[PDB]
Write a protein that holds these residues in place. Sequence first.
Motif, short mmCIF file in Angstrom:
data_model
loop_
_atom_site.label_atom_id
_atom_site.label_comp_id
_atom_site.label_asym_id
_atom_site.label_seq_id
_atom_site.Cartn_x
_atom_site.Cartn_y
_atom_site.Cartn_z
N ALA A 13 46.06 53.24 -24.82
CA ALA A 13 46.08 53.27 -26.24
C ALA A 13 46.99 52.21 -26.85
O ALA A 13 46.66 51.57 -27.82
CB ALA A 13 46.48 54.68 -26.72
N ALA A 14 48.17 52.05 -26.24
CA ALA A 14 49.09 51.04 -26.72
C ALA A 14 48.60 49.61 -26.47
O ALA A 14 48.79 48.73 -27.29
CB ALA A 14 50.44 51.24 -26.07
N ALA A 15 47.84 49.44 -25.40
CA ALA A 15 47.25 48.12 -25.14
C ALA A 15 46.18 47.83 -26.18
O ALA A 15 46.09 46.73 -26.71
CB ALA A 15 46.67 48.05 -23.75
N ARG A 16 45.37 48.84 -26.50
CA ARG A 16 44.32 48.66 -27.49
C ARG A 16 44.93 48.34 -28.86
O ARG A 16 44.43 47.50 -29.59
CB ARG A 16 43.44 49.93 -27.56
N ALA A 17 46.03 49.02 -29.20
CA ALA A 17 46.75 48.73 -30.43
C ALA A 17 47.31 47.31 -30.48
O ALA A 17 47.16 46.60 -31.48
CB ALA A 17 47.89 49.74 -30.61
N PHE A 18 47.91 46.87 -29.38
CA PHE A 18 48.43 45.50 -29.31
C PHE A 18 47.33 44.50 -29.58
O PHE A 18 47.52 43.51 -30.29
CB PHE A 18 49.09 45.24 -27.95
N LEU A 19 46.15 44.73 -29.00
CA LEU A 19 45.05 43.78 -29.13
C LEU A 19 44.48 43.70 -30.54
O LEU A 19 43.82 42.71 -30.88
CB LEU A 19 43.96 44.06 -28.10
N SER A 20 44.69 44.74 -31.33
CA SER A 20 44.27 44.72 -32.74
C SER A 20 45.42 44.41 -33.72
O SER A 20 45.23 44.48 -34.93
CB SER A 20 43.50 45.99 -33.11
N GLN A 21 46.60 44.02 -33.21
CA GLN A 21 47.70 43.65 -34.13
C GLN A 21 47.35 42.34 -34.82
O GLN A 21 47.76 42.09 -35.96
CB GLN A 21 49.04 43.48 -33.42
N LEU A 22 46.59 41.52 -34.12
CA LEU A 22 46.08 40.29 -34.70
C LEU A 22 44.63 40.49 -35.09
O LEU A 22 43.73 40.51 -34.26
CB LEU A 22 46.25 39.08 -33.79
N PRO A 23 44.39 40.68 -36.40
CA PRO A 23 43.00 40.90 -36.83
C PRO A 23 42.12 39.66 -36.70
O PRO A 23 42.17 38.76 -37.54
CB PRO A 23 43.14 41.32 -38.30
N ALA A 24 41.29 39.64 -35.66
CA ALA A 24 40.42 38.51 -35.39
C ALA A 24 38.97 38.80 -35.78
O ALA A 24 38.44 39.87 -35.50
CB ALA A 24 40.51 38.10 -33.93
N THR A 25 38.35 37.81 -36.39
CA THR A 25 36.92 37.84 -36.71
C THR A 25 36.06 37.15 -35.64
O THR A 25 34.83 37.42 -35.55
CB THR A 25 36.66 37.18 -38.08
N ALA A 26 36.66 36.28 -34.82
CA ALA A 26 35.94 35.64 -33.72
C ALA A 26 36.93 35.55 -32.57
O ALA A 26 38.12 35.35 -32.82
CB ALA A 26 35.45 34.26 -34.08
N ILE A 27 36.43 35.75 -31.37
CA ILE A 27 37.29 35.76 -30.18
C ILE A 27 36.52 35.03 -29.09
O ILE A 27 35.35 35.39 -28.83
CB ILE A 27 37.61 37.18 -29.68
N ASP A 28 37.13 34.07 -28.41
CA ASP A 28 36.53 33.38 -27.26
C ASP A 28 37.60 33.13 -26.22
O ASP A 28 38.31 32.12 -26.32
CB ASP A 28 35.88 32.07 -27.71
N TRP A 29 37.73 34.02 -25.25
CA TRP A 29 38.66 33.82 -24.16
C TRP A 29 37.88 33.10 -23.07
O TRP A 29 37.02 33.70 -22.39
CB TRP A 29 39.23 35.13 -23.68
N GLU A 30 38.19 31.82 -22.93
CA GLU A 30 37.53 30.97 -21.97
C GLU A 30 38.13 31.19 -20.59
O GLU A 30 39.35 31.11 -20.43
CB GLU A 30 37.66 29.51 -22.37
N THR A 31 37.29 31.45 -19.61
CA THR A 31 37.75 31.56 -18.22
C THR A 31 37.49 30.22 -17.52
O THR A 31 36.34 29.85 -17.26
CB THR A 31 36.99 32.65 -17.43
N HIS A 32 38.55 29.50 -17.22
CA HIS A 32 38.45 28.22 -16.50
C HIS A 32 38.31 28.46 -15.02
O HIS A 32 37.68 27.68 -14.34
CB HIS A 32 39.69 27.37 -16.79
N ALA A 33 38.99 29.46 -14.48
CA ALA A 33 38.95 29.77 -13.07
C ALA A 33 39.30 31.25 -12.88
O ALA A 33 40.11 31.79 -13.62
CB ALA A 33 39.92 28.92 -12.29
N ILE A 34 38.69 31.86 -11.86
CA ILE A 34 38.95 33.28 -11.55
C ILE A 34 38.78 33.45 -10.04
O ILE A 34 37.84 32.92 -9.46
CB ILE A 34 38.07 34.21 -12.42
N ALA A 35 39.72 34.17 -9.41
CA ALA A 35 39.65 34.40 -7.97
C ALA A 35 40.45 35.63 -7.65
O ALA A 35 41.44 35.91 -8.31
CB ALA A 35 40.21 33.22 -7.19
#
Length: 125
Positions: free
Chosen positions: A44-66
């Motif tokens: 719940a606290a993580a979800r709250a943190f993620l909405s502290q910044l009110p965003a209308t568009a979000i693009d988390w680019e993954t350059h690499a994952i392993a």
Amino acid sequence: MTPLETVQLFLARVNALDLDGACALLAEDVVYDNVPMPTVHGRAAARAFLSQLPATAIDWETHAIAATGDAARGTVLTERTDRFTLADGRTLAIRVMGAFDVADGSITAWRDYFDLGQFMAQMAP
């Protein structure tokens, strides 16, 4: 789901503007460690943190994952640029690497590594 698949699904759900569904993949007692910020405990606290910044568009680019570990449990490492647009038109692009510990399709810990000074500068109107 493998650890890798769990984190891919998390990041897809964030990019689909489905923060509720993304946070469902976090353990109820997740440790959410933005390394230069206070630690957040619990879904719940993580979800709250993620909405502290009110965003209308979000693009988390993954350059690499392993991932370390096996098909059930492991640590997934990511290299990203987290882009977002806020209500007011502020556009941000935060270079970040993140480690995600996963067990049986649930993210038990999430550690994000970035420079807070840069984050703050980008937030400055």
